[PDB]
Design a protein around this ligand. Sequence first.
Ligand code: GDP
Lengths: 85, 447
Amino acid sequence: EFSKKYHVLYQSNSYRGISTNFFEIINDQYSEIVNHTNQILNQKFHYRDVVFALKNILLMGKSDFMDALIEKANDILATPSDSLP
Amino acid sequence: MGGEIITLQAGQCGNHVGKFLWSQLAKEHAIGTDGLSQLPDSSTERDDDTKPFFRENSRNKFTPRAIMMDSEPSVIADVENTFRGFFDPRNTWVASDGASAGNSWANGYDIGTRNQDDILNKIDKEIDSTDNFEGFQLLHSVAGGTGSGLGSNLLEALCDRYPKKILTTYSVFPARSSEVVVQSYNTILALRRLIEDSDATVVFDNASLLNISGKVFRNPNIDLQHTNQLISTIISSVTNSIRFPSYMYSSMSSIYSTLIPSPELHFLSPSFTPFTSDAHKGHSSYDVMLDLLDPSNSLVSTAMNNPTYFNVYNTIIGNVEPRQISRAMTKLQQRIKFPSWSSSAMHVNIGRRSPYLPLQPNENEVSGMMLSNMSTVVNVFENACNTFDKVFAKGAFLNNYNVGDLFQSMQNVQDEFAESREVVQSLMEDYVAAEQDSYLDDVLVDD
Ligand SMILES: Nc1nc2c(ncn2[C@@H]2O[C@H](COP(=O)(O)OP(=O)(O)O)[C@@H](O)[C@H]2O)c(=O)[nH]1
């Protein structure tokens, strides 16, 4: 639906072709899209939560997790053998 | 590396303090007086509670992982009558015979063994509630013979029953020079056993806390019920790193590792910045922490005679700026003194202001606390020293406190007493050796 709106707005300026009004539409279109995109990234794809989580796990932002992991994994890690179950 | 913690109250002092503690913890996690979450559940913030201190049920009720013991059943009841659904009574117990309760020595030391099963049944049932268990934390008073005796029997019993677990306490002694004559046996004996466990304690005489409560609260009538608030802020903030963990601290095992390198000298001296437990300092993140070293706000007898430090731990909470606090660390380094032996790194964490507290109108109203291991901490219970010296040196009052057929022979009483004095003196011997540089050569130069 978004596109349909813009399609019409641009189509409606075919008489101007590439001009100021076209540019105005572009500037607005961009803002609408990015603003939209960033809502869904966070509302549907949990983008910021993913980011925080990555910090919390791979950059080890939260040590309670790492401590839990190592202690439960003490035998896994201690076992020198590869091909652990 | 960490795990769950069960708290304990032992004697009314831990109940009066305990109601302030539980009230503040309840505010910190939106728990309420009935123990139920006070928040709409938005399913945000992983640290919405602390698994280590509470057991959350289907009502989002946070049951304290705690056991409440006293010799005075009405104090237990009044705390239960404050925590009107929050503190579950199945874990409370009164160690009492009205006749023995007035005897600080006999009440505690007789129950410590006589009632060892009632004391332990609450403890063992809660420890077995989990797998990832780390330790225990008691609210006590060495003066509080009820707590001294059951605490002493648990110190030894738990060290044996749970060899790798962490066992500690916060102990408040009254700032009184003559009211401690009758306390001469239970306070020294509390030490006789506190010295036996490297995890055992943070110690204070309430001397400055009483004076602090009278200047900060709008109530010059200094009393325990107006001072336990200060106790609450200093103890509540200790676990901020557990409740709101980050990188270095999440547990007592971690705190231990950096604060007490010498199992022998585990006794700490606390202080704090203004607080909101019952507060807005108006300073930068470096200034609020510098004031923690100022003895006038020490929670114990204040000025120390050029104390030697063996180890200092701090936590700063609020809009903390690592660069500002670098001015503070530099300045603290020029005030903290030590031999090369204790020239350890000082450790300062950054805590978190709980999300369930009223929003801070100014995030720069940074607060904090200090815990330090110093040689002069022995002066904290100096009043007890004054009277146990007068009493023990004479063989005074042997079994005149109705010893419960333990050391019923007067010589055997004096031998138990001698051990407790050996402990007082050995405590300072280790604090003095700790002031030496040569301490380092004894096992490095020599084989
Ligand atoms: N800070 C504080 N100290 C207390 C409180 N109750 C008792 N005390 C102190 O504790 C010591 C006596 O211990 P108490 O707990 O009353 O005896 P117990 O019941 O046998 O353990 C004395 O130093 C009292 O001043 C309290 O609620 N708060």
